[PDB]
Every structure is written in structure tokens, then in C-alpha cells.
Design a protein around this ligand. Sequence first.
Ligand SMILES: CC(=O)c1c(C)[nH]c(-c2nc3ccc(N4CCN(C)CC4)cc3[nH]2)c1-c1cnn(C)c1
Length: 125
Amino acid sequence: MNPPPPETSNPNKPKRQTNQLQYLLRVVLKTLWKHQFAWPFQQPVDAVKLNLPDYYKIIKTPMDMGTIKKRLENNYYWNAQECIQDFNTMFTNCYIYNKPGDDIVLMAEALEKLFLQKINELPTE
Ligand SMILES: CC(=O)c1c(C)[nH]c(-c2nc3ccc(N4CCN(C)CC4)cc3[nH]2)c1-c1cnn(C)c1
């Protein structure tokens, strides 16, 4: 069964827009979005559709680039580090639930390299 997707806005959580957050959406997210291995990470894991009845029994902090995209578009993050933590959570969840050698793991490893490749240099203030 699928839990509700992660929130992309919160009236109690303060919003903020920075140069690095604009960079994280314009170049980081949107380039990773166009990678050939991006399709398994563009939406929350549908455990019912994907026949993964144990996914949310294991993953208690799910994350995907679709949620990250909407959060960046809604200025959900306070700074760039909070957004980067969502990217790291998405990758770590994939390595936690799956095993080395899986196609999904090779695809997450390729996106993670390109992710670190593009956050290596961020704009200043
Ligand atoms: C467990 C795991 O780490 C996974 C993650 C983070 N994501 C997927 C995943 N698998 C998919 C298959 C198809 C699609 N599509 C194609 C059509 N398009 C419209 C978008 C939806 C999206 C998919 N995401 C898996 C996965 C690996 N094994 N399984 C059985 C699921």
C-alpha cells in the first residue's frame, strides 16, 4: 500500500529562495531529470504498481526527484543543503532497499555521480 507522498509545501515551514537553490533547480534537477536513467526516480515509488509490498515497510523516509522538483518550485527549502539532503536520501533509500548489481542500483549510481558532479561547484551569494 502507498503512503501519502512527501509534502511539497507547509504553511508552518518558512520559504526561502537563494542563488544555490535556483541553481539546484535550473541546472542540477533539470539536467538529472533528462538523463536516460532518470525515469525510476521522477516520482514517488508506487509500491502497488511496482509489486514492492515491502518497500514502505523498509523505507520510512522516501524521496524522489518529482518531490524535489515541486519543493524547489514552491521554495520549500531554506537553503541548498536541505535540498541536497533530499537527493542523498533518494540515493541512500535505493541502496538500502536494493542489492549491488541490480539495474536500479546501477542507474542510481550513474545519477549520483552526475549529481555530485554538478553540486561540486555552486554559485555564491
Ligand atoms: C525499488 C527501487 O529502488 C525503485 C525506485 C526508486 N524506482 C523504481 C521504479 N521502477 C519503475 C518502473 C516503471 C516506472 N515507470 C515507467 C512508466 N513511466 C510513466 C513512469 C513510471 C517507474 C519506476 N520506478 C524501483 C523499482 C525497482 N524494481 N521495481 C520493480 C521497482
